Amino acid sequence: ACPAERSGHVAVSDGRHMFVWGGYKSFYLPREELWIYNMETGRWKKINTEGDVPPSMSGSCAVCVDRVLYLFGGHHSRGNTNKFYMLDSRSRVLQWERIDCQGIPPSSKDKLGVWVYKNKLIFFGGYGYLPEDKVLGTFEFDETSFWNSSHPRGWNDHVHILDTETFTWSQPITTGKAPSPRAAHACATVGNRGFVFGGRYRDARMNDLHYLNLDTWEWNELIPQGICPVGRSWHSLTPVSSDHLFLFGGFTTDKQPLSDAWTYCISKNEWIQFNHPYTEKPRLWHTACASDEGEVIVFGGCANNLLVHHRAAHSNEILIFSV
Numbered sequence: 619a620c621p622a623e624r625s626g627h628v629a630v631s632d633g634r635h636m637f638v639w640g641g642y643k644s645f646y647l648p649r650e651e652l653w654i655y656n657m658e659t660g661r662w663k664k665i666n667t668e669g670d671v672p673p674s675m676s677g678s679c680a681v682c683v684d685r686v687l688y689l690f691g692g693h694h695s696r697g698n699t700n701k702f703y704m705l706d707s708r709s710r711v712l713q714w715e716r717i718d719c720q721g722i723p724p725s726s727k728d729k730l731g732v733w734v735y736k737n738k739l740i741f742f743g744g745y746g747y748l749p750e751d752k753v754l755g756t757f758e759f760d761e762t763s764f765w766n767s768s769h770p771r772g773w774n775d776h777v778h779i780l781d782t783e784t785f786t787w788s789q790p791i792t793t794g795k796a797p798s799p800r801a802a803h804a805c806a807t808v809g810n811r812g813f814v815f816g817g818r819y820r821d822a823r824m825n826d827l828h829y830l831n832l833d834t835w836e837w838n839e840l841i842p843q844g845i846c847p848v849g850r851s852w853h854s855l856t857p858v859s860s861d862h863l864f865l866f867g868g869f870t871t872d873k874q875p876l877s878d879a880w881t882y883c884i885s886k887n888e889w890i891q892f893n894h895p896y897t898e899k900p901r902l903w904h905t906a907c908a909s910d911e912g913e914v915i916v917f918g919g920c921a922n923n924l925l926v927h928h929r930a931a932h933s934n935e936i937l938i939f940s941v
């Protein structure tokens with residue numbers, strides 16, 4: 619009929635159709651299901667996948683390139699993973715493919731972000747286990763995870779490249795000052811600039827903005843003039859044009875669910891707050907996808923503090939923002 623409510627799912631789009639997989643609610647959602655939303659008509663459609671179906675997961679990182687889907691990472695019932703999957707959505711019953719990649723993969727983690735640039739999928743940050751061996755960057759343990767679970771976890775500032783020409787992992791030699799290790803940040807790509815805003819680190823949910831030059835591997839920090847959005851994690855950051863990123867929702871340091879929306883103007887280096895009718899619908903750990911008609915499609919996520927699991931208000935609403 620319609621997709622069940624969920625948080626921490628993935629959603630990717632080609633501008634017409636939005637593909638939704640995974641997430642959890644109050645147990646993980648069925649791993650074989652793939653929900654497809656038509657951005658032009660508003661109808662959903664459920665299909666069942668086969669092949670090397672990934673385990674049902676929260677916090678995975680997914681992209682849609684040339685109508686083929688790539689999925690990295692996430693948290694399943696036995697923990698975090700660093701496996702890589704692809705799902706060709708061009709043609710026949712769709713088959714997931716686990717890709718045995720070459721090179722040193724990233725550590726097993728979730729709640730990260732990715733930038734697409736030509737043949738490269740570029741992943742940044744996240745939360746998961748200590749890397750099996752030293753990795754270019756820094757890993758910072760989360761104290762609370764030691765006593766809660768068998769395997770402690772922590773945040774990282776790693777940058778990894780999966781080159782789709784050969785499916786080989788590598789780490790670029792970056793210059794500049796990289797952002798601190800973080801998870802639940804939001805990543806967005808415009809041209810050769812890989813933007814990242816916000817995220818959780820230590821005891822803070824941050825408000826800084828940075829971009830990585832995807833042609834020179836140089837980190838730059840952006841300091842916009844005037845009023846800026848409150849620091850947050852579990853928010854969405856979506857390119858809406860060559861010159862504007864759309865920001866919505868999330869979760870403050872003081873654990874307040876957010877319903878504000880902003881546009882970040884790249885050319886002017888300025889934030890502009892966006893009026894919308896969903897002020898009473900804060901979401902965090904939702905997804906957001908841009909349509910070819912200048913809209914942003916938000917789905918799922920939780921309306922309150924999802925860390926109180928027995929009171930968590932997960933959603934299956936579609937919120938349309940006209941930009």
Ligand SMILES: COCOc1ccc(-c2nc(CC(=O)NCC(=O)O)cs2)c(Cl)c1
Nearest residue numbers: 642676693745801802818819823851852869
């Ligand atoms: C597998 O079911 C999902 O339910 C959850 C939801 C959240 C967490 C946590 N994530 C962190 C790391 C972080 O930066 N979290 C982002 C932040 O704190 O703003 C600390 S607690 C966990 Cl383990 C399980």
